[PDB]
Amino acid sequence: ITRQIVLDTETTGMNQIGAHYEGHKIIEIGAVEVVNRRLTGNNFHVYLKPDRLVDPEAFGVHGIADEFLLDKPTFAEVADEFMDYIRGAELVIHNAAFDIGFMDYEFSLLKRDIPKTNTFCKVTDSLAVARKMFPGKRNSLDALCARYEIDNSKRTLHGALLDAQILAEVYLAMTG
Ligand SMILES: [Mn+2]
Ligand SMILES: [Mn+2]
Numbered sequence: 684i685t686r687q688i689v690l691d692t693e694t695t696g697m698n699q700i701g702a703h704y705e706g707h708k709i710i711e712i713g714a715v716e717v718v719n720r721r722l723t724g725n726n727f728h729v730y731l732k733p734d735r736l737v738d739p740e741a742f743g744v745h746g747i748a749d750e751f752l753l754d755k756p757t758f759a760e761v762a763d764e765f766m767d768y769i770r771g772a773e774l775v776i777h778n779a780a781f782d783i784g785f786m787d788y789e790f791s792l793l794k795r796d797i798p799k800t801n802t803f804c805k806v807t808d809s810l811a812v813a814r815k816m817f818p819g820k821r822n823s824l825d826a827l828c829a830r831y832e833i834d835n836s837k838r839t840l841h842g843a844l845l846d847a848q849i850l851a852e853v854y855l856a857m858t859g
Pocket of ligand 2: 691692693841842843846
């Protein structure tokens, strides 16, 4: 009856000062649907053309090459379906402010008066939840994988769908 969408993004990078997303772009969105504590398998996964370069640090994390993104859709091209997918759900995101910041930024660039994500989705920060559950402990997604015996062996490089799927498993266990 209620949908949870476990979501992750990869980006061109991030700013350590000021708005973390300014001047950066989402290059991958990965989102997995959970209904009644079961993955439905109906997911959303896109790579996006950023029309700027990936910062070396970000490339160190996700390995998504500039060349790979050249033929991909723009955020504008996926935004409608993305909104249709997430609307009304509880979004579960590890360090939610990061991705939500990027999402609202990208939505805002569309100049379509799209309201903030948290006005049409519930936003749950699984990192805050993990910190509450495991105060004083490591709470990276990888740390949580070890804690909950979730396979992250394929996660040498981070990817948005990969990370969202891993987080969904972790979060189900956290709330189970
Ligand atoms: Mn992430
Ligand atoms: Mn990721």
